[PDB]
């Protein structure tokens, strides 16, 4: 009955659950707002999907994120991955596939790591 | 380029279940291929396919004795008649029962048809081709008579020579004689006395003796002689004689009455032909291992045409010369892969039968069948040179054939035994990479050395698609570890850059200008990556665009069937602007690589005898025992070799048993043509060649208001401004007008026209003169055109080289035709004449 | 007539006329129901649904006014000669005319009904009965009823037979009299008078299932059932109002259905022509009424455009079903239930059509290459507010795209009894439609039931959303329709300006639906989510490109790059898609006022129809008009393209349809219609054109004659070394015919018997092959050498099979020792002549190759032809130096230009 | 259980390798027992991920 | 796992490639194609020591040189090269 989408985000050892529901427009990380949770210089890494997609896409959703593990940098990268993948999955399920494809195209044109986490394996020059 | 693809000829299969036919001239051979009818012109090597398509497989072909009208019957009796000179569909009409016999009258006014027990003689409809002031009627067929004086299947119908009587041969062991209208000294008599049912009843030339050939292998003569007690005569039997084919029953016989000879094809594949009225065995031989299904004879009488249904196996036999005219074989398994030749004249396909064969695009015949693989053949590939073909297969060997000598100069194996399922080859032709499902390493051999260079590794799963870059610097592998690899092999450092994806990689393809690559995953999405800076630049989510399904034995809705929602194979255009994508589904998608939209979607088959060709099956075919196309009906067969089920339980990939009732629709390989303007796709029905339609569609380039064909010919003939007339014709884009002005300007003003011609119309002009060299008999004129064009616009084409690559390729193969066809003969003639003149 | 379009069939038309149907029982299981198109008859089967069995050909020259259906044949009487038209009576069988009836010379009356019995067929015209004998189909006599007044002679009602009465017809007059006429001797035998003579005219009469009881129905209201030999009234029923006279009556011959339990017989249905409700009587006690089936068809209104009435009632023979046919293009069959007692029946079969003329037409886009093609589904929006999907393949699989439970709403309102009407319960009349089945989900489009026109997207993306968008007459919403489900879609898009819709369009990808108001505003909606995406213009200078007048004809590029939108007042504007800003305008403002546009995908051409009676074709890529067409003498009603793009067809208000060749910029044909055409639609492949006329309900299908026979019509109206043509295959296997026959020999030989048949029978034309063309090749060559020209010998040798060519090239010889008798020297001189004339280079080289290959010994040992070889070598060396330099230059430079970096 | 497994591979949740398998008699060899797994859009796969609380809706 | 590779030899003739082609009315090759004799000049004739003359030797170049005309220095060098190959094996 309720519109709800749960999306994970991943870095070295920092993981993020983001549940996106129908709402008024808030984004909370660990119960505190997104403008509070980061080091003061990496908030520009957090605001990257919102500024790519515009605020009109985030006008309708409410995203709640939990993070665990990692350091400050790994947790910030996990939060921005959870934000981007979360709004793309909500627009996949509950509005049109053309809007899903437009959001995916804008995010992939900026940075692919907002959608697909690339782990660093060990394969040096063999 | 213009993505306006109609359906050109089917190819890759030469015969399927159905009747064979000759033209009344004797040259064209009409053969049914699934639900279409190919015409093989045999006097000049050509072939085409009629534009219709039946919903089920062809049951019957008939042809009006004038030659013009063809009438094709599907299963369940849906008939399409069409005009063979102007290849257009004329009438659709449904006989409500499955047609099991059909014969047109030699006068041309009637045709008789046997629906299982019934015998209906119909009128032949009046057509717009034959009347001056006439049109399509609504219901054109007028029934003349119906006869149900019969007890079982009508297996044959044969008219007289004066077209007043006909004979119906049966399955209730009795041939009958019928009339068209009520004659004076006639009763519709029966001809009883057989043992296993008549195959065919035939008249003689002077219609006194009529012959009956039955299924057990016995042919009887029938004459109108008096009863042995002597107005009082009876159609009785004068002599009987038997084909002594030992352990077989004859499946189809024919009888040429003008020359008096009878041919019979038997269940063990050995046919025999006999000069009938004294029954001297002319000869006999074994054309097929399986059986012979349908025999027809030439109108002249000098050619025979046999068709076996279980394989492709169509062959025409010239009996007095004792030699084949053609002996052709389609694939009897799933066509696994295909590639065009880099010239573009011939394509080569590799199926799971174990054979690979090289079909010619014109004339539709296979020209060589390489048969050294002992298991199913997967991917085949060419080099840039086009003379060498490398084929991988499941018997563990990547073989390497040379097509100027037709022998595998190399065979490669892995030391531990693998079964290769995918392969790529460097465009230099010196390195072969191949990958399998058993080991996750990816093997590399050298062509000029023969031994194994390396086993590259770094994949956590079996490697599914390999592609060498067309410049020659980068191998790309794609594997079920959700990963792809940019292998750089040829540099001094051998490196591997991974591309992490979301699901298992199914296909990898390059752009021709090698900066881009498209990889198709198992989600159903295409991702366009860059190879220099390895970042995804584009993407299509294409599940809905290809999802067309619901096979029989499928308890999901066609929208919920996963497995037919991915792209198994993708190929760029030779332009590089449009992908073409095909999977295990009914639809072929044609995407744009820049604007990321689906330009055009195609449907491979209308054929309802295949399994997955409509996404909403109807509830009429669902009984209370499952669907109606699922009950095992082998037990209702007259022949033991048809009744025996030698099938293995749970064998998806081929078994020699191969029940194969209602096979699935899947596009296992697609390829664009290197000359442009065509692609083709290996379906299960055949090998469909789609091509652009430019002659049946008006499409100007950049037109003004005062530019008509009348104005173009006016500035040609009156004003004599040849460059203006030619630019106006290329601007109108009508091929007849372009040909008219092109032939009309003179060969001394060619140079002035080319010197002042525009560079926006240069590539269209190069393509046009390439087509005119390959088709028209004005060879020195077109070569002066090509010479003036390249001598004037030399540095522009060499500067571009990517925008004009297809135009240069088709010009190159046009001058390759003229270089190999006439000047070798001219040189050999002048050297032979010089020697014979020097004694 | 025309030179391109030939008439095929009026489709979408089952019963439009006042001519009642006729039912014949086939066997014990089928009934044939035969109705009148107006120029033909349609026979449907009842057990097989009501799918069309036969339609009648050829089309009769006038309107059919009477019909009957005997054993197999259908008799059809046509033509009212009181106004011009020719008349006749024709006998059809299986939809083809098998016989004609000889009408009398002095027959100047329409022919109201036909009646076949005994061996006699009987035609009641107006005041006159013409009777033929059926076994020979010959004229017998003519019955003339007589009257004292002018009016009372008129034979309204008709004549019917009683079943056990030998050779007697029962005619009804305009006076109340029913006159019995013995049709053998042509004699008036009895007359029976109306009871209570205020009731004036016999409206109908029908035989009961009782013997010698006839049911006469008078215009003053009473139904009587009377013994017709006792002349005594059995029942008298006040069955009609004086304004609503009983017109059709029919009795149930089943044996049950009355008496408030259903196990007693005696039921009669009746209908008046001014109502649309049938009435059932139980005749048992006094003849009470038992039920009224209300609004079985549309009730006819003189003020409304929708037609209506009931033309005929027929109980079928011994069965519960009742077949009724109305004037509102509809045929229904109802059935009485058995186990619960139903006084009124329930509907089991129905076919229908438009109850009004057809307003707009649209052939559906092609299922990508499937069995539908472009030419199966037509989509017709009528003036009776319904959108029908017609099928040209089978006429039984065409069904109305339903707007919801309209008949359930009209029965739960008081719309079936007697406020608005059932047509007014629907969406308004359709102005235009545009559809794209790239995302039509078939039957399972959105599973479950959805709301209709409302004013969850994972399942929509999996299966498929709406397909058709539809602009209606004066409503501000542009409705949407599922196509594959055949129902109304779940969205209804408002304009944004508030003004009513003027045009609507759909994207090629099937996602976006663009509405364009009559006030100027253009809006774009996503059809999957039903949401407003982009407005044109958004909010040249960006933000200001808005139209000032109505928007007719928007259309989207198939690449989703531009949308080109056309104003009423003046200009055409190309907008960017994803931005919503104006890119480029073209202004024909002070001189034109554009009333429509059509677009051709695959050609990039747009055709605008302006108000100066002209059509301007513009290339959308170069943005300049390329073809203007000036032919119309009225306003352009509807115009369309050809799928090749080569023609544009325009139907104007002057009732002339004009075809323009677009490459030649000329007229081709212009044919005059009987009524002005209101809508045109060409199929997406080239066979069918469809025109919806003015006045006629149901569209007219024309075929395209140019696809089948070539027409030469272009009539502008107002009211060097060459090769040969010889096949490459032929001469290239002449050059190689030893190894080709060696590969064509089988591996194992044929198992010929020991007693082999010597002297096989001769096949081919006279002992040789049938490919050698019939009328001595040495005689040809030597008479060609006696003359100067070898063209006869060369044109003979060209048209040979390769085996016969190798034979006639191996069978040359020196012979007698003269220069005029040897074939070798003349063959060399013939090839020398062809090298001089520069005609057949490839064939000359192939012929010389095989000639030198099989004759080198004689030409080496002989000196009489080494001079000819020297002259041949001179010409050959010149020509091969020139041609080899040419082809080597082109080959080497092309191979360099393909890869210049080594 | 084998009964539930035959029901699941008749409903078509199981692929072997890259191709979905609808036949419940497909003989799985020793090196394809490493490649039998669920299909792409499987509700059974969503059930397993929803149990393990790793339900990624992307 | 397919099978162990076991040696199989195929005897090709000296016929043209249009004898390996399939049965059809005319060849797909042109007029230049159809003279390629399906075995290379190296299989028609290769000069080697087993097919040389008695007095002569053949070199690695495929050229007949006689032992009588060969000098002492070239004899010594050819003995050293054959001994070098023997030491390599």
Q: Does D14 touch chain B (CB under 8 A)?
A: no
Class of residue C775 by CB neighbours under 10 A (exposed 0-12, middle 13-18, buried 19+) = exposed
Instruction: Beginning with the edge strand found earlier in the chain, give each strand of the sheet holding B233-242 in spatial order.
Output: B198-202, B210-214, B218-226, B233-242
**Residue in B473, B474, B500, B494 with CA at minimum distance from that of residue B486:** B474
Place of tokens 């210049």: C900
Chain B hits for C9, Cβ within 8 Å: 138
Chain B hits for D19, Cβ within 8 Å: 563, 584, 652
Q: Does B539 touch chain A (CB under 8 A)?
A: yes
Q: Number of C-alpha atoms within 13 angstroms, CB side, residue B145?
A: 13
Using CA atoms, how far apart are residues C141 and C184, in angstroms rounded to an integer? 9
Alpha carbon separation from C580 to A97, B596, B635, C276 (Å, rounded): 20, 20, 67, 53
Across the interface, of B365, B406, B417, the residue whose CB is closest to E1 is B417
Using CA atoms, how far apart are residues B30 and B16, in angstroms rounded to an integer? 12
Q: Does A93 touch chain B (CB under 8 A)?
A: no
Nearest CA-CA distance, residue E19 and chain C, Å: 5
Whether C898 and B812 lie within 8 Å, measured CB to CB: yes
CB within 8 A of B11, min separation 6: which ones? B47, B347, B359, B361, B364, B680, B686, B687, B688, B689
- Please check whether residue B166 is in contact with residue B209, taking contact to mean a CB–CB distance below 8 angstroms: no
Structure tokens at B683: 């379906």
Whether D40 and B555 lie within 8 Å, measured CB to CB: no
- Longest C-alpha distance within chain D, in Å? 34
- Please check whether residue C359 is in contact with residue C383, taking contact to mean a CB–CB distance below 8 angstroms: yes
| Radius of gyration for chain B, computed over Cα atoms and rounded to the nearest angstrom | 31
Chain B hits for D21, Cβ within 8 Å: 652
* Method in brief: cryo-EM
Whether D20 and B438 lie within 8 Å, measured CB to CB: no
List Cβ<8 Å contacts ≥24 apart for C877-885: C877/B830, C879/B826, C879/C721, C879/C835, C879/C838, C879/C841, C880/B823, C880/B826, C880/B827, C880/B830, C882/C721, C883/B780, C883/B783, C883/B822, C883/B823, C883/B826, C883/C721, C883/C841, C884/B823, C884/B826, C884/B827
Question: Considering only alpha carbons, which residue of chain C is nearest residue E25?
Answer: C740
- Please check whether residue C843 is in contact with residue C731, taking contact to mean a CB–CB distance below 8 angstroms: yes
Across the interface, of B53, B324, B805, the residue whose CB is closest to C746 is B324
- Please check whether residue C201 is in contact with residue C175, taking contact to mean a CB–CB distance below 8 angstroms: yes
Q: CA angle B598-B341-C742, nearest 5°?
A: 140
Asked whether D and B share 3 or more beta-carbon pairs under 8 angstroms, the answer is yes
Place of tokens 């033909």: C40
Number of H helices, E strands in chain C: 11, 56
Alpha carbon separation from C734 to B61, C678, C780, C792, E31 (Å, rounded): 33, 64, 20, 20, 10
Using CA atoms, how far apart are residues C347 and C332, in angstroms rounded to an integer? 7
Whether A123 and B493 lie within 8 Å, measured CB to CB: no
Whether E19 and C743 lie within 8 Å, measured CB to CB: yes
Whether the CA torsion B621, B625, B626, B628 is positive or negative: it is negative
- Please check whether residue C295 is in contact with residue C317, taking contact to mean a CB–CB distance below 8 angstroms: no
CB within 8 A of B829, min separation 6: which ones? C845, C848, C849, C852, C876
Nearest CA-CA distance, residue E3 and chain B, Å: 7
- SS3 of residue C729 by DSSP: helix
Please report which helix (H) or strand (E) contains residue C501, including its range: strand C501-506
Q: Does B502 touch chain A (CB under 8 A)?
A: yes
Across the interface, of B329, B369, B419, the residue whose CB is closest to E2 is B419
Across the interface, of E1, E5, E24, the residue whose CB is closest to B438 is E1
Using CA atoms, how far apart are residues B573 and B5, in angstroms rounded to an integer? 13
Chain D hits for A89, Cβ within 8 Å: 57-58
- The torsion of the CA quartet B535, B537, B543, B548, rounded to 10 degrees, works out to -120
Whether A94 and C457 lie within 8 Å, measured CB to CB: yes
Q: CA angle A29-A30-A32, nearest 5°?
A: 65
Instruction: Beginning with the edge strand found earlier in the chain, give each strand of the sheet holding C330-335 in spatial order.
Output: C310-315, C322-326, C330-335, C346-351
- Please check whether residue B786 is in contact with residue B769, taking contact to mean a CB–CB distance below 8 angstroms: yes
Whether B544 and A108 lie within 8 Å, measured CB to CB: no
Nearest CA-CA distance, residue A107 and chain B, Å: 11
Place of tokens 């997609």: A53
CB within 8 A of C470, min separation 6: which ones? C381, C387, C430, C432, C433, C434, C478, C479, C480, C481, C504
Resolution (Å) of this entry: 7.0
Using CA atoms, how far apart are residues B471 and C45, in angstroms rounded to an integer? 69
Q: CA angle C189-C190-C196, nearest 5°?
A: 165
Alpha carbon separation from B398 to B361, B391, B477 (Å, rounded): 26, 6, 17
Using CA atoms, how far apart are residues C225 and C192, in angstroms rounded to an integer? 12
Question: Considering only alpha carbons, which residue of chain D is nearest residue A94?
Answer: D57
Structure tokens at B603: 């449907």
Structure tokens at C97: 């005319």
Asked whether E and A share 3 or more beta-carbon pairs under 8 angstroms, the answer is no
Question: Considering only alpha carbons, which residue of chain C is nearest residue A89?
Answer: C458
Chain B hits for C760, Cβ within 8 Å: 275, 282, 320
End-to-end, the C-alpha distance of chain B in Å comes to: 59
Q: What is the DSSP string of C585-645?
A: EE--TTT----EEEEETTTTEEEEE-TTS-EEEEETTTTEEEEEE---SS-EEEEEE-TTS
CB within 8 A of B831, min separation 6: which ones? none
End-to-end, the C-alpha distance of chain E in Å comes to: 35
- Please check whether residue B509 is in contact with residue B581, taking contact to mean a CB–CB distance below 8 angstroms: no
Q: What is the DSSP string of C131-168?
A: EEETTTTEEEEEE----SSSSTT---S-EEE-TT-TTE
E→C interface, C-beta within 8 Å? 15-16, 18-23, 25-27, 30-31, 34
Stretch 60-89 of chain A: residues touching chain D, C-beta under 8 Å:
85, 88-89
- Please check whether residue C535 is in contact with residue C563, taking contact to mean a CB–CB distance below 8 angstroms: no
Question: Considering only alpha carbons, which residue of chain B is nearest residue D25?
Answer: B650
Check the annotation: does A45 bind a ligand. no
Using CA atoms, how far apart are residues C402 and C485, in angstroms rounded to an integer? 9
Structure tokens at C87: 């008349």
**Residue in B219, B105, B122 with CA at minimum distance from that of residue B167:** B105
List Cβ<8 Å contacts ≥24 apart for C794-798: C794/C830, C794/C834, C794/C840, C797/C847, C798/C724, C798/C726, C798/C840, C798/C843
- Chains with ≥3 Cβ pairs under 8 A against E? B, C
Question: Considering only alpha carbons, which residue of chain B is nearest residue C3?
Answer: B133
- Chains with ≥3 Cβ pairs under 8 A against B? A, C, D, E
Whether E23 and B328 lie within 8 Å, measured CB to CB: yes
Across the interface, of B315, B395, B405, the residue whose CB is closest to E2 is B395
Chain E hits for C733, Cβ within 8 Å: 25-27
- SS3 of residue C805 by DSSP: helix
Does residue B658 come out as left (phi exceeding 0), alpha (psi in the -120 to 50 range) or beta? left
Residue B628 CB coordination number (10 Å): 12
Chain C hits for B698, Cβ within 8 Å: 603, 644-646, 662-663
Using CA atoms, how far apart are residues C520 and C505, in angstroms rounded to an integer? 15
- SS3 of residue B176 by DSSP: strand
Does residue B482 come out as left (phi exceeding 0), alpha (psi in the -120 to 50 range) or beta? left
Using CA atoms, how far apart are residues B57 and B13, in angstroms rounded to an integer? 14
Whether B808 and C898 lie within 8 Å, measured CB to CB: yes
Using CA atoms, how far apart are residues C441 and B537, in angstroms rounded to an integer? 31
Whether C743 and E30 lie within 8 Å, measured CB to CB: no
Stretch 28-57 of chain D: residues touching chain A, C-beta under 8 Å:
54-57
Nearest CA-CA distance, residue C783 and chain B, Å: 26
Chain D hits for B553, Cβ within 8 Å: 22-23
Using CA atoms, how far apart are residues D29 and B290, in angstroms rounded to an integer? 32
**Residue in C595, C624, C600 with CA at minimum distance from that of residue C611:** C595
Whether B523 and D26 lie within 8 Å, measured CB to CB: no
């Amino acid at each position: 009955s309720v519109q709800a989408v749960q999306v994970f985000g991943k870095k070295k050892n920092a993981t993020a659950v983001a549940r996106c529901v129908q709402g008024k427009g808030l984004i909370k990380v660990n119960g505190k707002p997104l403008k509070l949770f980061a080091p003061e210089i990496l908030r520009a890494k957090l605001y990257e999907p919102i500024l790519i997609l515009g605020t009109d896409k985030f006008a309708d959703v409410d995203i709640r994120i939990r993070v665990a593990g990692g350091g400050h940098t790994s947790q910030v990268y996990a939060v921005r991955q959870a934000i981007a993948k979360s709004i793309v999955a909500y627009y996949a399920k509950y509005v049109d596939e053309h809007s899903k494809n437009l959001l995916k195209q804008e995010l992939i044109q900026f940075d692919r790591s907002l959608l697909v986490a690339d782990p660093r394996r060990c394969e040096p020059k063999k | 380029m213009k993505t306006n693809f109609k359906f050109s000829n089917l190819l890759g299969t030469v015969y399927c279940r159905g009747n064979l036919l000759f033209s009344p001239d004797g040259t064209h051979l009409f053969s049914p291929v699934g639900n279409r009818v190919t015409v093989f012109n045999l006097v000049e090597n050509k072939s085409y396919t009629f534009p219709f398509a039946h919903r089920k497989n062809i049951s019957r072909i008939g042809l009006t004795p004038q030659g013009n009208l063809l009438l094709s019957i599907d299963e369940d009796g849906q008939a399409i008649l069409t005009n063979v000179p102007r290849r257009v569909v004329l009438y659709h009409f449904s006989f409500k029962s499955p047609v099991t016999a059909l014969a047109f009258s030699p006068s041309g006014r009637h045709f008789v048809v046997g629906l299982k027990r019934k015998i209906e003689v119909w009128h032949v409809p009046s057509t717009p081709d034959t009347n001056e002031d006439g049109d399509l009627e609504f219901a054109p067929f007028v029934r003349h008579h119906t006869h149900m004086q019969h007890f079982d299947d009508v297996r044959h119908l044969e008219w007289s020579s004066d077209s007043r009587f006909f004979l119906s041969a049966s399955k209730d062991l009795t041939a009958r004689i019928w009339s068209l209208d009520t004659e004076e000294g006639f009763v519709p008599t029966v001809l009883s006395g057989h043992r296993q049912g008549v195959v065919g009843a035939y008249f003689s030339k002077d219609q006194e003796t009529i012959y009956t050939v039955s299924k057990d292998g016995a042919v009887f003569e029938w004459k109108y002689v008096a009863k042995p007690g002597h107005e009082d005569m009876q159609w009785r039997i004068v002599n009987k004689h038997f084909f002594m084919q030992n352990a077989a029953t004859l499946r189809c016989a024919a009888y040429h009455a003008e020359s008096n000879l009878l041919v019979a094809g038997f269940s063990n594949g050995i046919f025999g032909l006999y000069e009938m009225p004294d029954f001297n065995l002319i000869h006999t031989l074994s054309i097929s291992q399986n059986e012979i299904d349908f025999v027809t004879i030439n109108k002249s009488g000098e050619w025979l045409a046999f068709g076996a249904s279980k394989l492709g196996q169509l062959l025409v036999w010239e009996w007095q010369s004792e030699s084949y005219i053609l002996k052709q074989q389609g694939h009897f398994d799933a066509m696994n892969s295909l590639v065009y030749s880099p010239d573009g004249q011939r394509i080569v396909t590799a199926a799971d039968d174990g054979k690979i064969k090289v079909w010619d695009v014109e004339s539709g015949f296979c020209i060589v069948t390489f048969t050294e693989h002992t298991s199913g053949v997967t991917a085949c590939e060419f080099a840039k040179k086009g003379s060498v073909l490398f084929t991988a297969s499941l018997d563990g060997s990547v073989r390497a054939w040379d097509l100027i000598r037709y022998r595998n100069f190399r065979t490669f194996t892995a030391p531990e035994r693998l079964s290769f399922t995918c392969m790529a080859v460097d465009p230099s032709g010196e390195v072969i990479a191949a990958g399998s499902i058993d080991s996750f390493d990816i093997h590399i051999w050298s062509v000029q050395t023969g031994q194994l260079l390396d086993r590259l590794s770094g994949h956590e799963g079996p490697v599914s698609s390999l592609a060498f870059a067309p410049d020659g610097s980068v191998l790309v592998s794609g594997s079920w570890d959700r990963t792809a690899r940019i292998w750089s092999i040829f540099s001094r450092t051998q490196t591997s850059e991974p591309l992490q994806l979301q699901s298992d990689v199914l296909d990898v393809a390059f752009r021709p200008d090698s900066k881009q690559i498209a990889i198709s995953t198992l989600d159903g999405q295409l991702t366009f990556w860059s190879v220099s800076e390895a970042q995804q630049v584009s993407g299509v989510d294409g599940r809905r665009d290809v999802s067309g399904g619901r096979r029989i034995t499928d308890r999901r809705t066609a929208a919920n069937v996963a497995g037919t929602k991915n792209f198994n194979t993708i190929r760029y255009s030779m332009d590089g602007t449009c992908l073409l994508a095909g999977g295990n589904s009914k639809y072929i998608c044609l995407y744009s690589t820049t604007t990321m939209v689906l330009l055009k979607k195609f449907t491979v088959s209308v054929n309802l005898s295949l399994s997955g060709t409509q996404e909403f099956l109807n509830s009429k075919l669902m009984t209370e025992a499952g669907p109606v196309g699922l009950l095992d009906d082998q037990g209702e067969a007259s022949d033991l070799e048809d009744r025996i089920d030698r099938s293995l339980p749970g064998s998806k990939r081929g078994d020699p048993g191969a029940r194969k009732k209602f096979p699935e629709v899947r596009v296992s390989g697609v390829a664009f043509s290197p000359t442009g303007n065509s692609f083709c796709a290996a379906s299960t029905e055949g090998l469909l060649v789609y091509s652009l339609d430019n002659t049946v569609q008006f499409d100007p380039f950049d037109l003004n208001m005062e530019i008509t064909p009348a104005s173009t010919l006016a500035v040609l003939e009156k004003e004599k401004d040849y460059l203006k007339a030619l630019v106006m014709a290329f601007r109108l884009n009508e091929a007849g007008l372009i040909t008219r002005v092109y032939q009309a300007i003179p060969y001394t003003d060619i140079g002035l026209v080319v010197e002042q011609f525009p560079t926006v119309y240069v590539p269209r002009l190069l393509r046009f003169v390439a087509a005119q060299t390959e088709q028209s008999p004005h060879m020195e004129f077109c070569l002066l055109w090509i010479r003036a064009l390249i001598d004037k616009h030399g540095p522009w084409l060499a500067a571009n080289r990517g925008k004009v690559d297809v135009e240069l390729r088709v010009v190159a193969r046009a001058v390759a035709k003229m270089r190999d066809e006439i000047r070798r003969l001219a040189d050999e003639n002048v050297y032979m004449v010089d020697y014979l003149l020097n004694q | 007539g025309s030179a391109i379009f030939a008439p095929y069939r009026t489709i979408g038309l089952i019963s439009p006329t006042g001519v009642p149907f006729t039912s014949i029982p086939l066997g014990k299981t089928t009934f044939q129901i035969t109705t009148s198109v107006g120029r033909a008859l349609q026979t449907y089967d009842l057990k097989r649904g009501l799918n069309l069995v036969f339609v009648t050909r050829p089309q009769t020259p006038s309107d059919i006014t009477a019909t009957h259906a005997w054993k197999e044949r259908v008799y059809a009487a046509f033509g009212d000669p009181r106004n011009g038209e020719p008349q006749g009576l024709w006998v059809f069988q299986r939809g083809k005319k098998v016989a004609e009836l000889p009408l009398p010379s002095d027959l100047d009356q329409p022919i109201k009904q036909i009646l076949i019995f005994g061996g006699w067929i009987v035609a009641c015209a107006l005041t006159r009965i013409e009777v033929w004998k059926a076994a020979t189909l010959e004229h017998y006599t003519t019955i003339f009823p007589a009257a004292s007044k002018k009016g009372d002679n008129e034979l309204t009602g008709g004549a019917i037979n009683m079943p056990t009465f030998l050779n007697k017809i029962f005619v009804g007059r305009k006076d109340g009299w029913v006159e019995i006429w013995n049709v053998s001797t042509g004699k008036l035998i009895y007359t029976l008078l109306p009871p209570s003579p205020d009731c004036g005219a016999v409206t109908c009469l029908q035989p009961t299932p009782a013997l010698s009881l006839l049911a006469i129905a008078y215009s003053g209201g009473p139904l009587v059932i009377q013994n017709v030999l006792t002349d005594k009234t059995v029942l008298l029923l006040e069955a009609g109002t004086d304004d609503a006279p009983v017109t059709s009556i029919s009795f149930r011959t089943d044996g049950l259905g009355a008496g408030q339990d259903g196990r007693k017989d005696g039921v009669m249905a009746t209908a008046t022509s001014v109502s649309g409700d049938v009435t059932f009587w139980d005749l048992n006690k006094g003849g009470r009424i038992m039920g009224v089936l209300r609004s079985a068809h549309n009730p006819p209104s003189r003020h409304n455009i929708v037609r209506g009435g009931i033309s005929k009632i027929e109980f079928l023979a011994g069965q519960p079903v009742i077949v009724t046919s109305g004037l509102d293009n509809s045929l229904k069959t109802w059935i009485f239930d058995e186990s619960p007692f139903s006084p009124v029946p329930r509907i089991l079969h129905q076919r229908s059509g438009h109850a009004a003329p057809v307003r707009c037409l649209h052939f559906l886009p092609s299922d990508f290459d499937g069995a539908e093609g472009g030419n199966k589904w037509l989509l017709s929006g009528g003036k009776d507010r319904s959108l029908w999907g017609w099928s040209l393949r089978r006429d039984g699989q065409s069904a109305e795209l339903s707007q919801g439970a309209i008949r359930k709403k009209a029965r739960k309102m008081g719309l079936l009894a007697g406020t608005t009407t059932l047509e007014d319960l629907k969406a308004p009349e359709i102005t235009c439609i545009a559809s794209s089945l790239n995302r039509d989900g078939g039957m399972g489009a959105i599973p479950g039931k959805q709301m209709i026109w409302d004013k969850n997207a994972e399942l929509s993306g999996n299966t498929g959303w709406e397909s058709v968008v539809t602009a209606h007459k004066d409503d501000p919403y542009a409705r949407t329709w599922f196509w594959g489900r055949r129902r109304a879609g779940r969205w209804a898009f408002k304009t944004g300006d508030g003004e009513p819709v003027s045009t609507v369009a759909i994207s090629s990808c099937g996602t976006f639906a663009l509405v364009g108001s009559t006030g100027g505003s253009i809006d774009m909606f996503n059809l999957q989510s039903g949401r407003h995406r982009q407005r044109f213009p958004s909010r040249f200078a960006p933000g200001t490109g808005r139209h000032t007048n109505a928007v007719t004809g928007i259309v989207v590029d198939p690449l989703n790059r531009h949308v080109v939108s056309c104003s009423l007042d003046g200009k055409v504007k190309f907008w960017d898609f994803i931005t919503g800003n104006l890119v480029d305008e073209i202004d024909w403002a002070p001189m034109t006022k554009i009333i429509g546009c059509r677009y051709h995908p695959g050609n990039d051409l747009i055709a605008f129809a302006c108000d100066d009676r002209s059509i301007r074709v513009v290339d959308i890529e170069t943005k300049n008009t390329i073809r203007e067409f000036w032919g119309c003498r009225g306003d352009i009603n509807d115009f369309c393209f050809s799928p090749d793009g080569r023609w544009i067809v325009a139907a104007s208000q002057d009732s002339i349809i004009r075809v323009w060749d677009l490459p030649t910029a000329h007229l081709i044909d212009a044919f005059r219609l009987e009524q002005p055409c209101t809508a045109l639609a060409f199929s997406h492949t080239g066979e069918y054109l469809a025109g919806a006329m003015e006045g006629s309900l149901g569209v007219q299908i024309w075929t395209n004659r140019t696809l089948f026979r070539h027409v030469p019509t272009r009539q502008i109206s107002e009211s060097m070394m060459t090769l040969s043509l010889v096949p490459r295959s032929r001469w290239q296997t002449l050059l190689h015919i030893d190894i080709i026959k060696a590969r064509n020999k089988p591996k194992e030989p044929p198992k010929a018997p020991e007693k082999a048949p010597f002297f096989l029978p001769p096949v081919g034309q006279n002992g040789i092959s049938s490919l050698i063309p019939q009328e001595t090749f040495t005689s040809k060559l030597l008479v060609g050498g006696a003359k100067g020209d070898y063209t006869d010998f060369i044109e003979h040798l060209k048209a040979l099979p390769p085996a016969a060519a190798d034979l006639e090239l191996r069978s040359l010889s020196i012979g007698n020792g003269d220069e005029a008798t040897n074939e070798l020297l003349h063959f060399i001189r013939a090839l020398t002549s062809r090298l001089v004339a520069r005609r057949d280079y490839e064939l000359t080289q192939a012929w010389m190759t095989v000639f030198l290959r099989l004759h080198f010994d004689l030409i080496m040992e002989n000196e009489e032809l080494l001079q000819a070889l020297g002259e041949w070598r001179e010409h050959q060396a010149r020509e091969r130096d020139r041609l080899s330099e040419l082809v080597g230059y082109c080959g080497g430079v092309v191979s360099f230009l393909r890869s210049p970096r080594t | 259980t084998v009964q539930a497994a035959t029901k699941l591979i008749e409903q078509g949740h199981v692929r072997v390798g890259v191709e979905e398998v609808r036949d419940p008699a497909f003989l799985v060899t020793r090196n394809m027992e490493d490649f039998v797994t669920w299909t792409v859009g499987s509700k059974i796969k969503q059930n397993i991920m929803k149990y393990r609380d790793k339900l990624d809706d992307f | 796992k397919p099978k162990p590779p076991a040696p199989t030899l195929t005897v090709v003739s000296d016929v043209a490639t249009v004898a390996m082609e399939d049965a059809q009315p005319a060849t797909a090759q042109g007029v230049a194609g159809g003279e390629t004799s399906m075995i290379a000049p190296q299989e028609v004739y290769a000069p080697s020591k087993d097919t040389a003359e008695k007095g002569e030797v053949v070199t690695k170049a495929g050229i007949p040189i006689a032992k009588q005309e060969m000098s002492r220095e070239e004899k010594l060098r050819r003995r050293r090269r054959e001994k070098e190959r023997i030491r390599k094996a």
